[PDB]
Design a protein around this ligand. Structure first.
Ligand code: NDP
Ligand code: CP7
Length: 217
């Protein structure tokens, strides 16, 4: 079956409009995807957005002890048929991991997993899991008790995961504001996904935003 579903590999990200420039063949003033701004100069285009911050925090930390049991079976089941506290898992590439003020790493109540090949335990003192590659990621999950695995960045981790059909659902936030960006959310065959949750329009500091949730067909 689908690994993505078996291990509930959901992806969450936040994008904003892209502030143009007056130079470069990279300018896409008419890109069909209005919200593709992911990062810039190693950080978030926008300013710490309180709301999304809260949203992201909420969603990635929420766990339902009961509903878990079902998932417990699903995985076990697959595990065997293949062989023939309770927190969520967060996963991020080195970049985004560094892009975080140490004072917030690792992320609380969440099993942190950093994807990288240039990091070692001697280097990372935080209590996190250092993964070699998506494959290991899978191997890791297989033997790990958690609610749902989350992919919180960055652009490469998304792409890779998407290209391998490892994303069950995507929690896509949208920040209505243009900001200079050098990193953008990767493309994919959206055909397999259908929006399942469209939140209302929220407001903060004067910048609008909303939350979407696309699911695999
Ligand atoms: N708006 C949003 O929701 C988000 C924005 N961001 C922003 O994006 C930018 C960072 O994203 P991006 O540049 O794509 O970087 P990433 O955070 O994805 O980090 C890239 C690094 O991750 C590693 N990596 C990726 N895939 C693999 C793999 N399969 N196996 C092993 N290592 C892997 C590599 O580590 P190594 O070099 O050690 O091999 C790599 O150089 C930042 O500015 C950050 O602020 C990040 C997340 C979310
Ligand atoms: C709150 C910012 C945020 N919001 C959403 N919706 N998704 C994310 N993946 C992140 C994020 C950004 C950089 C590093 C870790 C997580």
């Amino acid at each position: 079956e689908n690994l993505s579903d078996v291990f509930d590999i959901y992806a969450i990200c936040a994008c904003c409009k892209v502030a143009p420039t007056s130079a470069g063949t990279k300018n896409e003033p008419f890109s069909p995807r209005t919200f593709r701004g992911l990062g810039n100069k190693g950080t978030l285009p926008w300013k710490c957005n309180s709301v999304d911050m809260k949203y992201f925090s909420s969603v990635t930390t929420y766990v339902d002890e009961s509903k878990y049991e079902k998932l417990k079976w699903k995985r076990e089941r697959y595990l065997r048929m293949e062989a023939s506290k309770l927190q969520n898992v967060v996963v991020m590439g080195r970049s985004s991991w560094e892009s975080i003020p140490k004072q917030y790493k690792p992320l609380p109540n969440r099993i942190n997993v950093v994807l990288s090949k240039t990091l070692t335990k001697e280097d990372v003192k935080e209590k996190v899991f250092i993964i070699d590659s998506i494959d290991d990621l899978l191997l890791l999950l297989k033997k790990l008790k958690y609610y749902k695995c989350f992919i919180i960045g960055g652009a490469q981790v998304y792409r890779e995961c998407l290209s391998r059909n490892l994303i069950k659902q995507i929690y896509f936030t949208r920040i209505n504001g243009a900001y200079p960006c050098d990193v953008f959310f990767p493309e994919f065959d959206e055909s397999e996904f259908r929006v399942t949750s469209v939140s209302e329009v929220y407001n903060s500091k004067g910048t609008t935003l909303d939350f979407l949730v696309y699911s695999k067909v």
